[PDB]
Design a protein around this ligand. Structure first.
Ligand SMILES: CC[C@@H]1C[C@]1(NC(=O)[C@@H]1C[C@@H]2CN1C(=O)[C@H](C(C)(C)C)NC(=O)OCC(C)(C)CCCCc1cccc3c1CN(C3)C(=O)O2)C(=O)NS(=O)(=O)C1CC1
Ligand SMILES: [Zn+2]
Length: 201
């Protein structure tokens, strides 16, 4: 009820990227913790952005965001309704869908977008925040099985990251792990066709 002292949530901040440009996938950090905290408050991020898969953080969480068709997408369960920091200040979401666990902002200048997959292939690859490339067999519209199961710890913080086909097109956005006794045997994703439908609504 004390309106003048009510706080605002900070912006999502890009703090690094998963580099997939070469022969080796690796994580790069582009901003440290103090800079991230400051940038979340101001919403003003003048760092150069590159690549398709960004590592993003709020004050309380860190996860991934993936550019597809000129939109930087991530999970609602990480970003909520937050703005993203940008060179000219905070940028409001252009897509928000809590039912899909999906949000999106206009892709930052300097980023590159993945192309939506039209291959109809079921041999997929999940990219994690540690730049592991994990083979996943597609098992339905929104699920795929890990060829080698992992503790959920290994996948934590990778929501918002891509599932890719063999040619490196975007097939989906990772949202949840299918876990039993802490072991992830499968992953649940937002299919790229669902993003494409969201882009038409
Ligand atoms: C640990 C690596 C996981 C990727 C990850 N995500 C999660 O942790 C999501 C967040 C939350 C729970 N969850 C799970 O993965 C849980 C789990 C393992 C924690 C036990 N699994 C599950 O419920 O399976 C049940 C299943 C039926 C398969 C759900 C299907 C999806 C159904 C669904 C549909 C529509 C909307 C929503 C859902 C689920 N949803 C909203 C939602 O908010 O889920 C993460 O790394 N997050 S993160 O650390 O980056 C975080 C900072 C952002
Ligand atoms: Zn493809």
């Amino acid at each position: 009820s004390h309106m003048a002292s009510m706080k605002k949530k900070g912006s999502v901040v890009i703090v690094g990227r998963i580099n997939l440009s070469g022969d080796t996938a690796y994580a790069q950090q582009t901003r440290g913790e103090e800079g991230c905290q400051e940038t979340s408050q101001t919403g003003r991020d003048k760092n150069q952005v590159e690549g398709e898969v960004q590592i993003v953080s709020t004050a309380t969480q860190t996860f991934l965001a993936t550019s597809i068709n000129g939109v930087l997408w991530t999970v609602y369960h990480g970003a909520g309704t937050r703005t993203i920091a940008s060179p000219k200040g905070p940028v409001t979401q252009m897509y928000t869908n809590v039912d899909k666990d999906l949000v999106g902002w206009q892709a930052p200048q300097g980023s590159r977008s993945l192309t939506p997959c039209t291959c109809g292939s079921s041999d997929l690859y999940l990219v994690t925040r540690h730049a592991d490339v994990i083979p996943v067999r597609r098992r339905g519209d929104s699920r795929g099985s890990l060829l080698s199961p992992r503790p959920i710890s290994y996948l934590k913080g990778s929501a918002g990251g891509p599932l890719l086909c063999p040619a490196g097109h975007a097939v989906g956005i990772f949202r949840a792990a299918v876990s039993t006794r802490g072991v992830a045997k499968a992953v649940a994703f937002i299919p790229v066709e669902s993003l494409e439908t969201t882009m038409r609504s």
